[PDB]
Design an enzyme around this catalytic site. Structure first.
Site, mmCIF file in Angstrom:
data_model
loop_
_atom_site.group_PDB
_atom_site.id
_atom_site.type_symbol
_atom_site.label_atom_id
_atom_site.label_comp_id
_atom_site.label_asym_id
_atom_site.label_seq_id
_atom_site.Cartn_x
_atom_site.Cartn_y
_atom_site.Cartn_z
ATOM 1 N NE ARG B 15 -4.018 -1.771 2.388
ATOM 2 C CZ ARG B 15 -5.142 -1.669 3.090
ATOM 3 N NH1 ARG B 15 -5.421 -0.540 3.726
ATOM 4 N NH2 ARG B 15 -5.985 -2.694 3.155
ATOM 5 C CG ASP B 42 -6.836 -7.601 2.671
ATOM 6 O OD1 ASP B 42 -7.391 -6.670 3.291
ATOM 7 O OD2 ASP B 42 -5.720 -8.056 2.986
ATOM 8 C CG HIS B 45 -8.745 -8.864 6.988
ATOM 9 N ND1 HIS B 45 -8.864 -7.661 7.651
ATOM 10 C CD2 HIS B 45 -8.949 -8.594 5.677
ATOM 11 C CE1 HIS B 45 -9.126 -6.703 6.778
ATOM 12 N NE2 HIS B 45 -9.183 -7.243 5.573
ATOM 13 C CE1 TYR B 89 -16.412 -7.144 7.033
ATOM 14 C CE2 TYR B 89 -15.778 -5.951 9.027
ATOM 15 C CZ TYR B 89 -16.093 -5.952 7.679
ATOM 16 O OH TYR B 89 -16.062 -4.769 6.976
ATOM 17 C CE1 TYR B 90 -12.314 -7.844 7.374
ATOM 18 C CE2 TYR B 90 -11.973 -7.896 9.758
ATOM 19 C CZ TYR B 90 -12.198 -7.180 8.592
ATOM 20 O OH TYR B 90 -12.290 -5.804 8.639
ATOM 21 N NE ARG B 162 -14.772 2.895 3.609
ATOM 22 C CZ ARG B 162 -14.167 2.770 2.430
ATOM 23 N NH1 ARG B 162 -14.469 3.589 1.424
ATOM 24 N NH2 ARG B 162 -13.266 1.811 2.253
ATOM 25 C CE1 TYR B 164 -14.047 1.803 8.311
ATOM 26 C CE2 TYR B 164 -12.786 3.271 6.877
ATOM 27 C CZ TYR B 164 -13.607 2.171 7.040
ATOM 28 O OH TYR B 164 -14.001 1.454 5.935
ATOM 29 C CG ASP B 193 -17.309 1.851 9.204
ATOM 30 O OD1 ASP B 193 -17.381 1.099 10.200
ATOM 31 O OD2 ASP B 193 -17.449 1.438 8.031
ATOM 32 C CD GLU B 221 -20.530 0.439 6.681
ATOM 33 O OE1 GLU B 221 -19.338 0.221 6.373
ATOM 34 O OE2 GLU B 221 -21.436 0.651 5.841
ATOM 35 C CG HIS B 246 -19.410 -4.425 6.500
ATOM 36 N ND1 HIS B 246 -18.959 -4.013 5.263
ATOM 37 C CD2 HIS B 246 -18.952 -3.513 7.390
ATOM 38 C CE1 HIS B 246 -18.254 -2.903 5.401
ATOM 39 N NE2 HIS B 246 -18.235 -2.577 6.682
ATOM 40 C CB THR B 296 -14.240 -2.147 -0.380
ATOM 41 O OG1 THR B 296 -12.984 -2.527 -0.947
ATOM 42 C CG2 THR B 296 -13.978 -1.066 0.665
ATOM 43 C CB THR B 297 -11.861 -6.616 1.900
ATOM 44 O OG1 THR B 297 -10.960 -7.022 2.937
ATOM 45 C CG2 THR B 297 -11.380 -7.198 0.560
HETATM 46 MG MG LIG Z 1 -9.134 -5.830 3.587
HETATM 47 MG MG LIG Z 2 -17.467 -0.640 7.089
#
Ligand SMILES: [Mg+2]
Ligand SMILES: [Mg+2]
Ligand SMILES: [Mg+2]
Ligand SMILES: [Mg+2]
Ligand SMILES: [Mg+2]
Ligand SMILES: [Mg+2]
Ligand SMILES: [Mg+2]
Ligand SMILES: [Mg+2]
Lengths: 374, 374, 374, 374
Positions: B15, B42, B45, B89-90, B162, B164, B193, B221, B246, B296-297
């Site tokens: 990144r 991804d 996680h 989630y992951y 957005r 966090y 979020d 969110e 989500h 998205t992830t």
């Molecule tokens: Mg991700």
């Molecule tokens: Mg979110």
């Protein structure tokens, strides 16, 4: 790739009983010469008014003309905007949307040179079990006649039936006793269908005496008034057997899901507005971990084929379904009427593009009716 | 038409921040030479363990080998049987199923010589609005740096973000005050979020002071712990703004629907197991008359393209979505990355068959990684 | 006193049936030469992917290195942060946390020169009643074979069994009829386990015909889909017998408590993440005035010993438990395989420090497997 | 290793205000010469009757004599059998069980040559934030005196206080206004404690005007009558701030959990029956994802130390606690009192075995009282 014209052919095919149901065969033409066919199945249901087909054709052309048939989501939103869901079992707008969306599936599949099955997610199985209907008794005097029906369809391969009950419980009971007696385990009655004519408590009482006979019983259908979600729930709690109900609108389905009112969702394209809408309903059921069965309004071959493809693509159909419409008619308007073998409805040849059914101009002309009047 | 081989390429693309996320690029080969490409986006996680790709390839080949790629429903049921939904989630199983199902969509579309868009129901629009993320502040000292990020992305066209929040409310508040001050109405922050880090009552308190700033706010969110359906509901009742969450399993989605716990369902193929599963989730939302947004992830171009096609086919996306993954990476493994313009993600040229994205072998080799180790 | 190294030994011990389950034996070393042993029991469960043990060892060393083994609360919080609870029965993260936390208990106890029993709250009893499993019948043809199993284990002292049901009710029924016939009251079947394969209404129907046979029946286990709390509750209300369910996450347990969905909490360290987590679950049950039973995933001696110590320290175990894992394997990796006498599992010798079980290097080497590959 | 004798020393230590609270210092002797010390803290609470200590000693010896102190679970079950939980805040049976169980923890720890902290799960932190109490105003004339108390304790390091409110809202309001005025942000009042004297609606009205002043307010405590679970819930829904309540029995705690009636569980060994019972309550809270704070009845050094060890071992204490009992007394019966610094209670030196507090026979003798008479 665009829609250039539309045709609506009204037809009347008499049932073996004499009553003539009216249907509308759909043809959607394109600029590349490909044509999709669909069926607005059985308009012969209340309310007691009829739709002007000349006006309807204009309205639908206004919607479809120039559009790309592959824009199914877009077109369906527009169809629903003009023919809103009504929360009523026999909303004629559903029959209309159904014929168009199904014709669109046939059209797209033909264009891609693939079976509608491969446009719907492929195959999970090659056929689905179906049942033949025995309509409700009014007098015990009708029992004999219905036993003859059972014996006849059984030799033709249909070992599973559904029984409409609720009008004369003594007659219902006699019939069931007689079938158990004569056929033993050779025949199964997978469902006792109340058709919304009893309030849930009266249905419960009926269910209690009818289920004394269990010939492969799979479900109790429509044991409460239309849209009586709370009643279905209460009955679901007092009944060992799964409770099934037809899906006629997303609003109605949403409520039965939220309330956990039923166990099996009876889905049929004609009542929900087509394959696109039926798939959504089936998937909503799947997401909710609920079972599904394909229902019917007694459609002809084109409408039945739609369900054959759909049914063989779903992973949550674990009970016997109802589409045996062709068995009730003296004819059809196709070159190849759908086939039933050993009480099973097979998905059309996967190597044949489109719906796998072909219209017959001579028959379309023979069963032609001036309009949808009563 | 059958699957003959499978390839799993592990890659690590850093990144702009330096952290290197690992992804697995998928290739599904057939007997006719057609190959579908997908992305297990991804894997970096929690849980803190990694999947053996050599073993995984064998397991997946065992499943797919010899199958007809068009049997999406069948294949997906089998994938879910082997990689069950986890309610987490992951869940890495979701990422895995996602890569395979998406590759299958690319494969089928290529075979039919059509865009994945036309295999998903067509187009309702040509692009969807997205937002760029501003990660949560820990210290007020980070506010300045994030204002620079906003100013930079804004000139590049991203006018919607957005944010966090939840770790340092004083910092969150300063940031929001500073943006309102410097940018006025030039920028919008469509979502606050919480990422499940606060219990609903603490979130409510936070929401109360943060919403003092409303820069085109569209939703709040994840304002409750994972799977706290009752908490989401209670908070939904005390908050004027729509609540979004989500979707990571059908069971979880089913519960949020039954309970009317949220207003907007944030759906992303990677978290639900692919396009086939994401469509079902989107349709279940539609049947329940609920709004949807694409989540998205932080996927690369191949995974983002999947959402571009999906997003432009849905009729219930009425808010800004989140897929701007490519914007966070220094590179990718494709010839041409997805296209953003004025804060919108465009669906690939409908004239191009398949996903409309093509792998770049040299870039795959360049960013190659031995495994998915931490 | 600090952790200096960690060892993870993958082993495959075949069951008498031939299937080879994989486990990971844990060793945690310290600066003072003391070593704690633990067991990440049975990784052979879906999802169909496997964990990279080389990567895992690095991740866990990153967590444990330099830490004081007595900081159980701290270490467990960190373990849960990296291996979050998933709400899924077989979350591999639970197995991982379990092996580490149990090894830590062994380590601390050894350091203090006391039995793990005295580190867990002492003794309430010296042994707990357990049962041997009879796996679900698929065909009535399997009944005879299972009757032989019952007769064999009965002479070995196991007079109590648990029966997995739900696939073939006719077969389940025949088996139960045959056992009642041949053994009378000599044998007891303390539980009918549905293993989440039936929706609650179908389970209710099954329960109705199966409970016609009551051979010391104590509970009905998992008579509803995973996490179907409302279904468990409804079934709990229609069933005279106690309803039991496995505990796989605190979130899940919290919901079953709030809703009063079950009567008996089936707790097992492997499924909840270790002794520390299992004690918390057991105490939460106690605070809620609910009964507990120890469950199993078929662990070896080291994992079973953990439950022996735990079980003999709890005051709310009033039913028969399930840990008879060693009875299903052809061997183990210890110097002293766990003791089963008269259908009872005895807590290890209280005069022996630690878990009271010792590893055998020769056996560890014999059953060694290169990885957890499927 | 067994218990051979027990000693109960009644003592009366005057508060700086003159009122003399009575406590009972516990000594549990063994066959190996080790002695555990505990404290039955503050018997000076309603009901207006007193316990015969000569009779009590006989009853407790009957229970403990010959037992292995490490059998904490067994001994606690027996203690609860003889001194059942009452659902009443100040049940004297709780104070009694508390002194015994805490002495047992000290005894076991000493035997093992470790700190009670290492017998409770280790350390998560080395100290916990506490607050000093300002008792409820009856007349506005008392405000000045209380401002002096705040100024005095603040210079001694206590920057956080808890305020008892509800009797005279005008006085409560003046006090809060005066503190905000004089101290600004130098002081925090983390809680407004109603002590169950108002019905929830009256509390809501009070909360509305009192929270006009927010000096680091963390919670509203006991804003409803004792055991009014529904009232707490309703108030929890109408209050932005977390609601806290003392835990006095497992039954009461179970109900507040099931109903989600509160946000923070105020746990204190004395009110729940000891360290063993307090840990269970804390873990039940943890399993329910609920926050905890340590409460107080104004114990001396021995009782306060118990909480110091407990508090530093819990992972769910995220707010300020209340144990500053020693600060209200003119003396104690120990060689070295607990340590406070900057408003924090420190866990005794971990290298010191046992509770880390030692009795002073001289002080015991000088503060001894004939009985617990009022
Ligand atoms: Mg991700
Ligand atoms: Mg979110
Ligand atoms: Mg029907
Ligand atoms: Mg009809
Ligand atoms: Mg079980
Ligand atoms: Mg297992
Ligand atoms: Mg208080
Ligand atoms: Mg007191």
């Amino acid at each position: 790739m665009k829609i250039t014209d539309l045709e609506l052919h009204a037809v009347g095919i008499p049932r073996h009983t004499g009553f003539v149901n009216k249907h509308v065969i759909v043809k959607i033409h394109t600029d590349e010469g490909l044509t999709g066919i669909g069926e607005m199945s059985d308009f012969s249901h209340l309310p007691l008014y009829s739709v002007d087909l000349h006006d309807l054709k204009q309205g639908l052309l206004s919607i479809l003309l120039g559009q790309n048939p592959f824009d199914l989501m877009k077109i369906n939103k527009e169809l629903t905007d003009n023919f809103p869901e009504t929360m009523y079992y026999y909303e004629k707008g559903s029959f209309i949307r159904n014929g168009i969306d199904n014709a669109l599936h046939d059209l797209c599949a033909k264009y891609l040179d693939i079976s509608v099955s491969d446009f719907l997610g492929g195959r999970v199985k090659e056929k689905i079990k179906v049942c033949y209907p025995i309509f409700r008794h009014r007098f015990s005097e009708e029992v004999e006649s219905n036993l003859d029906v059972v014996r006849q369809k059984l030799e033709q391969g249909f070992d599973v039936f559904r029984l409409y009950v609720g009008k004369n419980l003594d007659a219902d009971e006699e019939f069931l006793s007689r079938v158990k007696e004569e056929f033993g385990s050779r025949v199964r009655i997978k469902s006792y269908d109340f058709s919304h004519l009893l309030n849930w408590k009266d249905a419960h009482r009926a269910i209690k005496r009818l289920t004394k006979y269990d010939l492969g019983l799979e479900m109790i259908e429509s044991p409460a008034p239309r849209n009586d979600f709370d009643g279905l729930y209460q009955l679901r709690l007092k009944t060992d057997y799964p409770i099934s109900e037809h899906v006629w609108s997303f609003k109605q389905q949403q409520e039965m899901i939220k309330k956990d009112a039923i166990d099996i969702f009876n889905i049929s394209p004609v009542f929900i507005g087509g394959l696109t809408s039926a798939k959504k309903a089936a998937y909503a059921a799947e997401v909710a971990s609920k079972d599904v069965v394909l229902g019917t309004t007694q459609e002809l071959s084109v409408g039945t084929a739609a369900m054959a493809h759909l049914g063989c693509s779903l992973t949550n159909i674990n009970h016997t379904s109802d589409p045996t419409g062709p068995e009730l008619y003296v004819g059809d308007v196709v070159k190849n009427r759908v086939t039933y073998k050993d009480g099973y409805l097979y998905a059309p040849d996967r190597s044949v593009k489109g719906l796998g059914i072909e219209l017959d101009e001579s028959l379309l002309a023979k069963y032609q009716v001036p309009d949808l009047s009563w």
